[PDB]
């Protein structure tokens, strides 16, 4: 499934992994709430967890965050945000 990802400050292998995980999350779940929950659980289980995930259609978000720990991208009309905050 096609996606547009140009907002990141963080390594490309892990952005690829996050984008892939979001792909299977969208495939399994149709509710954005459960999509965010699944992305959070998988990504927190596999890397060091104080992560945070936001799904939206039109909203406003921005955060102070750990360096090299921030990601924001799109699936067509939906937007996804993932940042470290602890």
């Amino acid at each position: 499934r096609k996606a547009i990802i140009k907002n990141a400050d963080m390594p490309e292998d892990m952005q690829s992994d996050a984008v892939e995980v979001a792909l299977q999350a969208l495939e399994k779940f149709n509710i954005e709430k459960d999509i965010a929950a699944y992305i959070k659980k998988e990504f927190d289980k596999k890397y060091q967890p104080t992560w945070h995930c936001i799904v939206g259609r039109n909203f406003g978000s921005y955060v102070t965050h750990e360096t090299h720990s921030f990601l924001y991208f799109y699936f067509g009309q939906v937007a996804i945000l993932l940042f470290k905050s602890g």
């Binding site: 400050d9 709430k33 929950a37 102070t64 360096t67 090299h68 921030f70």
Partner: protein, 124 residues
Amino acid sequence: DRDAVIERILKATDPVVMSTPVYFDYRKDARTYRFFPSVGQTARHFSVDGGSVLKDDPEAIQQREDRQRREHDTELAARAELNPDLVDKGVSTSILKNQFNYSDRGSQTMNNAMVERCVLTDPP
């Protein structure tokens, strides 16, 4: 198409430095978050602190003499404790820091436990 003019630019900046770190400036009037004035594009790669200072450093000589003074005070207090009349004669004792010249500190920083919550955005 093949006759198009294409320009390329070469640079000395660091793409590893692609985020601007902040610090909380704790001014009484500010309470702010503030970016650093500049993050040098000159990359830093490897570092060792170093552990060598030549013997002729005045600070090193002073601290070395301080170490001889410390050990001399150590035997001074040792024989003063062994012969109690020397303490009356004027030899110091507290330099030998015993269990009654020492004590242990220990403290905790209070914090509060984290929890997990969810919200839902109802349609208009």
